[PDB]
Design an enzyme around this catalytic site. Sequence first.
Site, PDB file in Angstrom:
ATOM      1  N   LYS A 202     -25.276 -26.510 -24.423  1.00 26.50           N
ATOM      2  CA  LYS A 202     -25.269 -27.497 -23.389  1.00 26.50           C
ATOM      3  C   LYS A 202     -24.323 -26.889 -22.353  1.00 26.50           C
ATOM      4  CE  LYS A 202     -25.485 -31.711 -26.429  1.00 26.50           C
ATOM      5  NZ  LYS A 202     -24.680 -32.914 -26.803  1.00 26.50           N
TER       6      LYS A 202
ATOM      7  N   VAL B  95     -24.620 -17.635 -23.909  1.00 21.88           N
ATOM      8  CA  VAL B  95     -23.725 -16.630 -24.488  1.00 21.88           C
ATOM      9  C   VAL B  95     -24.463 -15.302 -24.636  1.00 21.88           C
ATOM     10  CG1 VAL B  95     -22.142 -16.127 -26.419  1.00 21.88           C
ATOM     11  CG2 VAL B  95     -22.382 -18.482 -25.588  1.00 21.88           C
TER      12      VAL B  95
ATOM     13  N   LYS C 248     -19.587 -15.646 -22.066  1.00 18.91           N
ATOM     14  CA  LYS C 248     -20.147 -16.999 -22.061  1.00 18.91           C
ATOM     15  C   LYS C 248     -20.240 -17.453 -20.613  1.00 18.91           C
ATOM     16  CE  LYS C 248     -18.796 -21.457 -24.008  1.00 18.91           C
ATOM     17  NZ  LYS C 248     -17.614 -21.997 -24.725  1.00 18.91           N
TER      18      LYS C 248
ATOM     19  N   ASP D 268     -15.074 -30.061 -32.333  1.00 17.79           N
ATOM     20  CA  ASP D 268     -16.476 -29.633 -32.473  1.00 17.79           C
ATOM     21  C   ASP D 268     -16.634 -28.646 -33.620  1.00 17.79           C
ATOM     22  OD1 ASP D 268     -19.234 -29.830 -31.892  1.00 17.79           O
ATOM     23  OD2 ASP D 268     -19.132 -28.323 -30.285  1.00 17.79           O
TER      24      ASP D 268
HETATM   25  C1  LIG Z   1     -24.032 -19.262 -29.220  1.00 15.04           C
HETATM   26  O1  LIG Z   1     -23.913 -17.985 -29.889  1.00 15.04           O
HETATM   27  C2  LIG Z   1     -22.785 -17.774 -30.555  1.00 15.04           C
HETATM   28  O2  LIG Z   1     -22.011 -16.897 -30.292  1.00 15.04           O
HETATM   29  C3  LIG Z   1     -22.613 -18.773 -31.669  1.00 15.04           C
HETATM   30  C4  LIG Z   1     -23.059 -18.171 -32.984  1.00 15.04           C
HETATM   31  O3  LIG Z   1     -23.469 -17.015 -33.054  1.00 15.04           O
HETATM   32  N1  LIG Z   1     -22.975 -18.968 -34.045  1.00 15.04           N
HETATM   33  C5  LIG Z   1     -23.587 -18.642 -35.325  1.00 15.04           C
HETATM   34  C6  LIG Z   1     -23.085 -19.535 -36.431  1.00 15.04           C
HETATM   35  C7  LIG Z   1     -22.664 -18.784 -37.668  1.00 15.04           C
HETATM   36  N2  LIG Z   1     -22.409 -19.676 -38.796  1.00 15.04           N
HETATM   37  C8  LIG Z   1     -22.325 -18.960 -40.067  1.00 15.04           C
HETATM   38  C9  LIG Z   1     -21.515 -19.701 -41.100  1.00 15.04           C
HETATM   39  C10 LIG Z   1     -21.665 -19.431 -42.451  1.00 15.04           C
HETATM   40  C11 LIG Z   1     -20.911 -20.092 -43.401  1.00 15.04           C
HETATM   41  C12 LIG Z   1     -19.978 -21.057 -43.028  1.00 15.04           C
HETATM   42  C13 LIG Z   1     -19.191 -21.752 -44.084  1.00 15.04           C
HETATM   43  C14 LIG Z   1     -19.219 -23.140 -44.202  1.00 15.04           C
HETATM   44  C15 LIG Z   1     -18.494 -23.784 -45.186  1.00 15.04           C
HETATM   45  C16 LIG Z   1     -17.723 -23.059 -46.069  1.00 15.04           C
HETATM   46  C17 LIG Z   1     -17.682 -21.686 -45.965  1.00 15.04           C
HETATM   47  C18 LIG Z   1     -18.408 -21.033 -44.984  1.00 15.04           C
HETATM   48  C19 LIG Z   1     -19.837 -21.322 -41.669  1.00 15.04           C
HETATM   49 CL1  LIG Z   1     -18.696 -22.508 -41.127  1.00 15.04          CL
HETATM   50  C20 LIG Z   1     -20.588 -20.661 -40.720  1.00 15.04           C
END
Ligand SMILES: COC(=O)CC(=O)NCCCNCc1ccc(-c2ccccc2)c(Cl)c1
Length: 328
Positions: free
Chosen positions: A48, A52, A67, A155
């Site tokens: 929103k 990126v 970003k 968030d």
């Molecule tokens: C917009 O582009 C961006 O740069 C954003 C962007 O690239 N995001 C990708 C989100 C990545 N998520 C991966 C992930 C995997 C595991 C956990 C986890 C949860 C609970 C306990 C342990 C691990 C979490 Cl929090 C995240």
Amino acid sequence: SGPVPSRARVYTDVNTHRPSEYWDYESHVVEWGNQDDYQLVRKLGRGKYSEVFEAINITNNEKVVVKILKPVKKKKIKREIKILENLRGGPNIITLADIVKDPVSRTPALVFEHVNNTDFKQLYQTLTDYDIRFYMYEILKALDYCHSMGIMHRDVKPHNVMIDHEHRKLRLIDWGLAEFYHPGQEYNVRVASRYFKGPELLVDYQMYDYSLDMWSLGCMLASMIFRKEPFFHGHDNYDQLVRIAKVLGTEDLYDYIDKYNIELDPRFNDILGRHSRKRWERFVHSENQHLVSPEALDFLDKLLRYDHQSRLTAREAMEHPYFYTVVK
Ligand SMILES: COC(=O)CC(=O)NCCCNCc1ccc(-c2ccccc2)c(Cl)c1
């Protein structure tokens, strides 16, 4: 008499005792460098009001993350910049490296350290009990740090946690909804993403604090250990509270509302119903039993509480037996 006031149990007065230069983001002077040092490589995602990209810093041949912000509200861009500057160098916090504008379009853009996000959908069935404990602890380091700096993230969700699994490196990103905590302040409840919204937001209790992030963290832990994404699957903000009530029960919801003298919205009238308090053991199944333990369930029970004051702080969470197996 209206709702009962509340304040954080930890880091209550950290901003109160700092000069205005620290928390007065509207007065902060931004120095927008030159975007020509960066060349955009590929789109990583779209939010929103932001897009990126992976980019390259042509002066040193190093990859960066850029970003690009749709400047719909200038005050919000100033807030994110000031918070990123304040938190720069904190453990597992994304590092702001530059701030630039398109000489021609003048659209603002934030330049960050590069993070090699591993695609996860692939390897969620790969994570072990130890891996979940390890990464939960890395998120807690980021939260205890930003809370200690008087900032609530607001968030916390998996999309805002980048993990480079090969290097066991985690970064908490997207500080666009973050805010400075000032005791007694009434905040906008239209923050966080639906599945991760704390009960305080859903009942329109504005005097919330860092403990909101601990609820969101609890939602992520529950979804990982139980392999149920999301854990609380609401279809709108009112239904989101009903999904929570189907697990935590309606008795403790009324105790929470009564403690803070909260007026429950009439939209809850026909949908809330009556629900018993569920045992966390009821979410254990053959697909997720290798990730669940008595310690994990006790830890989850201490995060997922209606009463924001009763939830573990990030520092208390780091001292829990669930983390006895991780390096601290
Ligand atoms: C917009 O582009 C961006 O740069 C954003 C962007 O690239 N995001 C990708 C989100 C990545 N998520 C991966 C992930 C995997 C595991 C956990 C986890 C949860 C609970 C306990 C342990 C691990 C979490 Cl929090 C995240």
